[PDB]
Design a protein around this ligand. Structure first.
Ligand SMILES: Nc1ncnc2c1ncn2[C@@H]1O[C@H](COP(=O)(O)OP(=O)(O)O)[C@@H](O)[C@H]1O
Ligand SMILES: Nc1ncnc2c1ncn2[C@@H]1O[C@H](COP(=O)(O)OP(=O)(O)O)[C@@H](O)[C@H]1O
Ligand code: BEF
Ligand code: BEF
Ligand SMILES: [Mg+2]
Ligand SMILES: [Mg+2]
Lengths: 100, 49, 164, 50, 417, 417
């Protein structure tokens, strides 16, 4: 299965997700001090062919998305700052997200 | 917005049609440049295999 | 946007406990809470998503009283001359439209209202279907015991309570 | 022009005032009464002393 | 500015009015759009407006004011009302509402009725106090609706023979069993002219469903009455909508103690439309016609009655038979034993150039003694006794000759002695 | 260089013209592509161009100029116009536009109309001032469209009997109920030749839908009129597109106060195409035909009318019956009671070598007294009286014999005395 930039990161506090947008990317003008999730990178590890129904249901009821590996990139420890710009580039044919 | 006018056609109609031609050509060139810029800024980019 | 709400209304597993009408009114309440959270004022509004025709909209409730606090929901008992109210109390308006219903806070409050109302709906359905049994003997397995209350599984998502 | 003169002006004159729709009425009722005052009140000492 | 006095004006008059009002060339937008723009500007000049229209409540609960010329359709010239007014003044479908209206706003697309000054030609206070049409107790027709004009022209005979064949009264249920190529439109025109001349007090209602537009424009400015029709250029949705709403208007008028008469043409095409508009019921009978599909038409046909308290609802619906259609065959089979007033027209006499092609023995009226005195009772009894042994075409021509020999029915009765 | 005077030239002439213009061997590209390349070079030599075409506005709002020979299709020879011109000169679908055009540019794929000099054979200034076709008030046909040629040949009888069966006038609504193997193409050719000889003032419009190509090439160079057709080698999309656009052209012509006559063949196949092009409506009646699928064809059939102000739109559509098709059965059932002019052709007489196979008693015309004086009125009445008791084939052969015995209808009327 391919990798996604969804914002539905499991096994993480809601305060860490509060910095992300509805897509999974931090807003423009958000302060970060320590290692914090600023992109919602997920990688499937188990079963493939996730049906969209159960996909959206995991965000509402039932269990969470196991095939994630929590591969969301974070800023290194010690470095701080405020994000000021985002640049997204997609492969030809792949549907762009709303931030693009 | 009401360029459509006409009186004493013998020269007025000629000048008005020349100006309408110029206006149409300008608008169409601007629209084509707009579409080219949009297609250039919206096309995807190759990243990696 | 309407495609997303159609997908979320069709993807309901327990369509019985929550048919399209109450699901849409739950979404209306969620969008009303989202609009309340949008403005610093506290104004109650309705949505009326137009289930089968198209996308959603928003209205503005007045709740006509002689008060003045929070004037977004304050209209005197006689402000029915212009804008076609014609009634003493209960006159509302469609003034506010263009409600954002897809950001992070909106999605969070939507999910919150949805889970609250699915709980309420399962409660209502189980009580309406097993209330007439009041006066009859029914079996059931307990699942949690405490020093003040214990729970019982009856089946088909039915929960019974036994106090001290 | 003065807020002490506008506080003695209930809504009955707003919806009758020309060029006043729904956004302007919403503004004049929100950004005006949110400061603690009310649209339409009964005072007499105005303007002291001018 | 009233909507009727502006819409019944010719289209060219509206164009010149809009051009005098300082507008763009009005030859582009449609009549409804022209009226909408004209009202927009006429309200931009102030001019508190006074409008009117027939009410339609949708599934949401609000109301739309449709106009009669547009055959009760949706357009920019419509007036919107919130359910608050419907809850206050206790409105319902079919109630014509007239009163003060205002300009629209941004985001709004229709006008708003502020206060009603007339509901079905009545005070808005008494509009909430009115007995329901369903709660009324029907009765038989008592007051005779005489159709004899009195001039004895070449067209008056069309009504004379009618009065000689089957009496008609207020609240009577009427069917016209006539094959095509028979001149049912001529019969309808004659009966409309007769009811407009003889009884101008009762409101006349003529309805043409699934009809060619030529007859529509002919009837809209030939008879003295509010003519609403619906051509075949629209799906069955508009047909059933106008049927429901005209019957609601008739019911409201009867509730206001008014004698209404609905001329319908044709009941067969209306039943066809009602069949193709309703979803399937599960099974199918001969002709592709659904079972419950006829419930709504049947109701429409049964709404006619003579109210004991006051008012009446007479109906005269033309049926299409002998068309070689299985659907029309079963529709006529269902509708045969439904009403108490029937008029059969013979196609053989119709396309034999003997007008009006009527069938005496096949036509009649139940409880006809309640619609005529003993005098015409015995006269019609003698007429039936003398016409029963006779044939169809010979008897028809003999009767029409003896009828044209005089002016009215009284002279014919006297010469029959 | 005009587009028509270049396209109506033979293909070999275009090949030699392109070869003289210094081009690659033109036998590879298609006719549209040949015209496109020829115009490209002829504009590369300067030569400010003058083009023409029928307008089609897409969903975006721009306009495309289609040509008549290509049956209004999309090709490189098309002329593009921006919605600015449509907003300025107030254009609409079906309006034929002719004026100055320029070469294209890189990235552009069609020519651009700079200024219009003719809109529906009118001044571009008056093109914005024209009453809408829908706002017109229809009426019955008044001016008689005589079909009698006058030479009395073996083919003129085909029209003579026609005039002896059902009169036809401007703005009349016509149906041809004829089974296959009957020679409807011969009837259409005869009526086209008659309308071209007798009334050359009114523009003739003949349309062949879902037809074999042989009849297309026969009609395109046999009758005197603009022949647009559409063979079965294309999906129903092109069929419904050409139907809509030819009816829009007819409506624009009538709005310009022009008498147009549309010969259509066949209405049954056109309804079939309209059914298979429209998405489903939810339910299904017998024959696999959708409910609203007939809304567009019905409208097409109802567009015919006699305008009171000026102009007329006559239609003569041939229907396919007796084909053993459930779909065609229900289509004919729907279309039977729709028009006021019908001509029934008997298959038994058709394949009995008795031409033209006509049905007298089954055919007729409503309000025929408005299309003929009292003289022919009484003559046709006597003819109907004498032909009604007779059979079908014997009466048909007797009438055609007595018709061929003379030259015109007047001599037949005189010998009938
Ligand atoms: N009472 C009458 N007197 C004289 N002629 C009549 C009479 N009724 C009908 N007709 C003739 O019969 C024809 C019927 O035409 P139409 O009304 O179209 O038939 P229908 O409406 O029955 O289909 C008319 O052209 C008219 O000339
Ligand atoms: N009125 C007529 N006079 C002479 N021949 C005819 C006539 N009508 C039909 N035919 C003959 O019958 C044949 C019918 O061919 P076609 O037009 O394809 O059939 P249809 O149009 O009836 O389906 C023609 O070849 C023609 O020779
Ligand atoms: F008026 Be006809 F009989 F359709
Ligand atoms: F012209 Be045939 F009837 F196909
Ligand atoms: Mg008729
Ligand atoms: Mg043929």
């Amino acid at each position: 299965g391919p990798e996604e930039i969804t914002a539905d990161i499991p096994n993480v506090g809601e305060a860490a997700l509060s910095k992300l947008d509805e897509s999974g990317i931090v807003y423009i003008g958000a302060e970060v001090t320590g290692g914090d999730i600023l992109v919602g990178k997920v990688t499937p590890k188990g079963e493939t062919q996730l049906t969209p129904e159960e996909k959206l249901l995991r965000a509402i009821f039932g269990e969470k998305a196991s095939d994630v590996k929590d591969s969301s990139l974070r800023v290194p420890n010690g470095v701080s700052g405020t994000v000021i710009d985002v640049q997204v580039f997609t492969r030809d044919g792949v549907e762009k997200d709303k931030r693009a | 917005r009401w360029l459509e006018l006409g009186l004493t056609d013998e020269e007025k109609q000629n000048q008005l049609e020349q100006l309408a031609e110029q206006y149409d050509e300008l608008k169409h060139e601007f629209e084509k440049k707009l579409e080219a810029k949009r297609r250039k800024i919206t096309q995807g980019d190759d990243l990696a295999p | 946007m309407n495609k997303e709400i159609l997908a979320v209304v069709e993807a309901v597993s327990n369509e019985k406990a929550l048919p399209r009408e109450k699901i849409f009114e739950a979404l209306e309440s969620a969008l009303a809470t989202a609009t309340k959270k949008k403005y610093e004022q506290e104004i109650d509004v309705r949505v009326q998503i137009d289930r089968k025709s198209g996308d959603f909209d928003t209205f503005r409730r007045w709740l006509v009283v002689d008060e003045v606090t929070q004037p977004t929901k304050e209209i005197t008992l006689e402000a029915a001359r212009y804008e076609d109210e014609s009634l003493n109390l209960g006159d509302y308006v469609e003034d506010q439209i263009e409600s954002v219903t897809f950001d992070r806070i909106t999605t969070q409050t939507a999910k919150q209202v949805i889970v609250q109302k699915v709980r309420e709906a399962e409660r209502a359905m189980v009580v309406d279907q097993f209330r007439e049994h009041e006066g009859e003997i029914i079996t059931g397995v307990v699942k949690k015991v405490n020093r003040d209350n214990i729970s019982l599984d009856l089946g088909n998502n039915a929960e019974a309570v036994i106090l001290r | 022009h003065y807020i002490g003169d506008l506080v003695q002006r209930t809504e009955v004159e707003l919806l009758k005032t020309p060029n006043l729709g729904k956004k302007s009425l919403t503004e004049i009722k929100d950004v005006l009464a949110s400061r603690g005052l009310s649209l339409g009140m009964r005072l007499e000492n105005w303007p002291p002393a001018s | 500015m009233n909507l009727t006095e502006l819409k019944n004006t010719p289209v060219s008059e509206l164009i010149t009015l809009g051009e005098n009002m300082g507008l763009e060339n009005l030859a582009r937008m449609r009549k409804q759009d022209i009226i909408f723009a004209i009202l927009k500007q006429h309200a931009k000049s102030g001019e508190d407006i006074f409008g009117d229209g027939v009410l339609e409540i949708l599934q949401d609960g609000f109301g739309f004011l449709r106009s009669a010329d547009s055959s009760y359709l949706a357009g920019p010239d419509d007036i919107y009302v919130s359910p608050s007014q419907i809850r206050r003044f206790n409105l319902r479908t079919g109630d014509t509402i007239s009163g003060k209206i205002r300009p629209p706003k941004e985001g709004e697309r229709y006008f708003a009725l502020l206060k009603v000054n007339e509901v079905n030609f009545d005070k808005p206070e008494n509009a909430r106090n009115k007995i329901l049409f369903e709660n009324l107790t029907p009765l038989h027709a008592n007051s005779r609706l005489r159709m004899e004009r009195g001039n004895g022209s070449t067209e008056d005979l069309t009504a004379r023979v009618l009065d000689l064949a089957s009496p008609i009264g207020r609240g009577q249920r009427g069917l016209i069993v006539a094959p095509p190529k028979a001149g049912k439109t001529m019969l309808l025109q004659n009966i409309a002219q007769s009811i407009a001349y003889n009884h101008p007090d009762c409101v006349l209602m003529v309805l043409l469903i699934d009809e060619r537009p030529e007859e529509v424009t002919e009837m809209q400015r030939l008879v003295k009455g509010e003519v609403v029709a619906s051509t075949f250029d629209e799906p069955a949705s508009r047909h059933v909508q106008v049927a429901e709403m005209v019957i609601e208007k008739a019911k409201r008028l009867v509730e206001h103690k008014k004698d209404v008469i609905i001329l319908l043409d044709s009941i067969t095409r209306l039943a066809r439309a009602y069949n193709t508009v309703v979803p399937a019921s599960g099974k199918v009978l001969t002709g592709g016609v659904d079972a419950n599909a006829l419930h709504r038409p049947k109701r429409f046909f049964g709404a006619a009655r003579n109210v004991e308290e006051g008012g009446s609802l007479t109906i005269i619906a033309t049926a299409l038979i002998d068309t070689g259609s299985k659907m029309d065959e079963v529709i006529y089979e269902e509708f045969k034993g439904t009403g108490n007033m029937e008029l059969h027209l013979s196609r053989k006499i119709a396309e034999k150039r003997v007008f009006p092609a009527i069938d005496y023995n096949r036509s009649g009226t139940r409880k006809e003694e309640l619609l005529t005195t003993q005098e015409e009772l015995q006269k019609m009894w003698i007429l039936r006794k003398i016409i029963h042994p006779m044939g169809e075409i010979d008897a028809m021509e003999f009767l029409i000759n003896k009828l044209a020999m005089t002016k009215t029915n009284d002279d014919f009765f006297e010469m029959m002695k």
